[PDB]
Amino acid sequence: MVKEFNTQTELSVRLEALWAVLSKDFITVVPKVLPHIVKDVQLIEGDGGVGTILIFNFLPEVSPSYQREEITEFDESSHEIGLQVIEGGYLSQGLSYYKTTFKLSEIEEDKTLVNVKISYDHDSDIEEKVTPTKTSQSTLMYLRRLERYLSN
Numbered sequence: 608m609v610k611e612f613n614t615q616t617e618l619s620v621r622l623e624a625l626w627a628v629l630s631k632d633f634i635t636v637v638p639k640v641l642p643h644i645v646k647d648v649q650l651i652e653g654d655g656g657v658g659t660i661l662i663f664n665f666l667p668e669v670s671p672s673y674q675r676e677e678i679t680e681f682d683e684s685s686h687e688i689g690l691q692v693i694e695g696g697y698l699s700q701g702l703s704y705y706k707t708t709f710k711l712s713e714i715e716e717d718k719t720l721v722n723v724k725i726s727y728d729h730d731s732d733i734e735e736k737v738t739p740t741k742t743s744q745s746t747l748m749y750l751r752r753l754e755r756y757l758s759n
């Protein structure tokens with residue numbers, strides 16, 4: 608069964624600037640903020656609303672070298688986006704289901720709360736173990752990098 612792991616971070620960024628990047632501009636911004644991981648991102652189907660499929664190609668060092676992602680939720684009223692791995696990425700590392708959902712809310716004019724929900728399940732017959740503690744840490748690192756990018 609799918610479990611949910613919640614964490615959060617607060618970033619010194621403006622809510623709508625962060626929402627733009629997390630929900631839309633991540634196509635150009637992701638390789639710029641994670642240049643040691645991500646080579647490029649391409650929209651394969653859809654234009655950025657729900658149902659949109661994207662491929663992330665990682666640097667050739669990296670393994671797995673790609674993930675195919677689907678936008679499964681896009682709520683601009685509540686600033687919530689859900690992004691599901693449908694192939695590759697953690698699904699090549701022992702996880703049977705993986706989704707990341709970001710919900711933003713204002714703390715101040717230039718401070719924003721990011722609630723991060725990781726939805727996941729494992730297949731126990733695969734020996735490699737990857738915990739949502741570990742995967743959440745990667746997501747937070749990405750957020751902190753995004754913070755630095757928006758604040759220069």
Ligand SMILES: C=C1C[C@]23C[C@@]1(O)CC[C@H]2[C@@]12C=C[C@H](O)[C@@](C)(C(=O)O1)[C@H]2[C@@H]3C(=O)O
Nearest residue numbers: 633637641644645663676690707745746749
């Ligand atoms: C360091 C990370 C964090 C990634 C996976 C990665 O290994 C590299 C790509 C990051 C990411 C970038 C944008 C999206 O917010 C995310 C859910 C995704 O699909 O890809 C993000 C995704 C995630 O947060 O799990």
